[PDB]
């Protein structure tokens with residue numbers, strides 16, 4: 388029993404974190420095989436924040452302008468290239484702790500673990516979700532750029548996020564490991580702002596299913612809803628639309644608990660209307676939306692506490 | 694910016710987890726130097742657990758009755774003994790991934806990271822506090838016994854918890870690595886219950902400081918109070934007493950933010966007496982008590998390992 392924000396064990400990623408220095412800037416890089424990946428803005432100076440021309444900045448750099456430190460060891464850079472907003476530094480040594488890995492670009496609502504690092508050394512690990520507005524609500528200080536987000540499945544690390552910047556509202560923006568930003572953001576210091584965010588409806592439903600599996604039913608009701616009526620209500624609370632894809636994805640949790648998806652939609656509708664009236668769900672007084680259907684199945688018992 | 698429930702990086706502990714099997718029971722062990730540590734209840738059948746005599750059950754077992762698997766490799770057990778409620782299996786090979794470590798017993802209110810494991814395979818990491826009632830609000834399924842909790846200081850892993858059981862309310866109980874239980878619990882299938890829990894006041898104050906540092910200031914007010922007056926409010930609301938040591942520990946946060954502890958105690962008193970009035974603090978509608986003062990300082994400073 389229990390239900391926690393649970394991250395993946397971070398050791399496989401810890402073995403890949405290095406420190407990249409260019410001029411006076413130091414940030415983190417990810418060392419896989421003989422390549423170190425890091426945000427391309429490591430090459431910007433004070434004058435390159437608003438309108439950097441990364442091609443012109445990079446052509447002026449030689450391999451030995453990049454200092455890469457893995458633990459106490461200097462790595463020698465023997466090549467460099469830019470791919471979208473990530474810099475790929477070829478180094479003379481393959482990382483002997485390279486795990487089985489892949490690069491995956493995720494969709495809004497997906498979760499992943501973040502290994503926050505500073506000067507190439509990891510500080511902590513926590514769970515994040517890609518918000519509908521393509522930001523993440525992380526915990527990042529200066530020096531954390533190049534920290535990565537990931538999932539682990541059967542000893543294979545799927546890298547899905549690299550940290551690039553903090554927006555004015557205190558939320559965070561970054562790229563996949565191919566250097567393509569999530570959302571409309573760019574690696575420039577011009578005024579940009581996250582769109583209005585919304586609640587991840589399919590995840591809230593997943594977490595309500597988690598609560599039932601762990602033995603709590605107080606929020607259910609005798610009602611159902613059509614999918615369209617549910618969506619008409621939920622968008623009045625700034626909830627994301629629920630699609631037939633989402634209904635299908637919730638099938639397994641519905642079968643395990645015996646609660647039809649649209650019946651749990653009816654429970655959510657009433658929860659938005661009523662609040663919790665001094666009660667909690669899985670220890671929270673708010674509706675939680677950073678557990679996916681897959682997250683719930685991976686953490687919860689396959690046997691409902693009836 | 695940002696404030697998240699954050700665990701220590703778990704790599705140093707992952708390299709120590711092994712699978713321990715005795716008869717039909719598989720659970721997790723901690724492999725350090727040439728010893729594997731696991732719950733002594735690994736040797737019990739279901740019937741044994743109704744009333745186990747552990748020394749008696751252990752005599753019947755021989756070294757080859759303990760199957761220990763590190764990843765894909767078997768470890769040969771060459772000795773076995775008990776220390777309190779943990780079994781110590783001496784093996785032929787020292788763990789080459791043994792970190793610098795110590796065994797430490799923590800105090801209620803202190804936090805630690807839990808590496809949840811099944812069949813010797815780490816599955817997840819999360820942050821826990823030792824509750825005042827000596828339980829932890831963990832997330833564990835069957836097969837999780839022997840999963841461990843820890844803190845890291847520089848390069849040194851301080852192991853503080855080994856998982857042994859789940860109580861009927863779904864919270865969890867275990868031992869330190871010397872096998873001493875946290876709380877009034879025993880490793881046998883008998884009637885046991887979590888006692889009434891309380892809220893960890895110094896941690897709530899720490900988290901309020903975290904909120905101020907992150908720009909969440911609506912609950913600040915012009916008032917202050919005294920330790921004696923506040924502790925009357927704390928006891929009324931089932932909060933732990935605040936001591937002068939707690940005030941001293943929060944000293945740095947009071948200096949950094951300009952809210953003295955008794956100044957912040959006045960904010961907390963008002964939150965206890967009136968509620969949150971529809972507002973949230975660091976995205977919570979509840980007052981969070983599983984961040985210590987050091988947790989807040991570490992995460993708002995960027996200390997690494």
Ligand SMILES: Nc1c(Cl)cncc1Cl
Nearest residue numbers: 527528529530552553694
């Ligand atoms: N200054 C930063 C950077 Cl560069 C990245 N993440 C967070 C902050 Cl506050």
Ligand SMILES: Nc1c(Cl)cncc1Cl
Nearest residue numbers: 388833834835837858859
């Ligand atoms: N059955 C258990 C055990 Cl033995 C330990 N932790 C949690 C659970 Cl649900």
Ligand SMILES: [Cl-]
Nearest residue numbers: 915916917918
């Ligand atoms: Cl006053």
Ligand code: NA
Nearest residue numbers: 914916956959
């Ligand atoms: Na005050």
